[PDB]
UniProtKB/Swiss-Prot annotation:
Induction: Repressed by abscisic acid (ABA) and drought stress. It comes from Oryza sativa subsp. japonica (Rice). Plants overexpressing PYL5 exhibit abscisic acid (ABA) hypersensitive phenotypes. Plants overexpressing PYL5 exhibit tolerance to salt and drought stresses, but are hypersensitive to osmotic stress and ABA during vegetative growth. Intracellular abscisic acid (ABA) receptor that functions as a positive regulator of ABA signaling pathway. Together with ABI5, PP2C30 and SAPK2, is part of an ABA signaling unit that modulates seed germination and early seedling growth. Acts as a positive regulator of abiotic stress-responsive gene expression. Inhibits the protein phosphatases PP2C06 and PP2C09 when activated by ABA. Monomer. Interacts with PP2C30. Binding to PP2C30 is dependent on the presence of abscisic acid (ABA). Interacts with PP2C51. Binding to PP2C51 is dependent on the presence of ABA. Interacts with PP2C50. Binding to PP2C50 is dependent on the presence of ABA. Interacts with PP2C53. This is Abscisic acid receptor PYL5. It comes from the Eukaryota. It is found in: Nucleus; Cytoplasm, Cytosol. Expressed in leaf sheaths and leaf blades. Expressed at low levels in roots, flowers and seeds. Belongs to the PYR/PYL/RCAR abscisic acid intracellular receptor family. Signal peptide: none annotated.
Length: 6
């Protein structure tokens, strides 16, 4: 699980 953002 890799999550990038805001």
């Amino acid at each position: 699980a890799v999550a990038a953002g805001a």
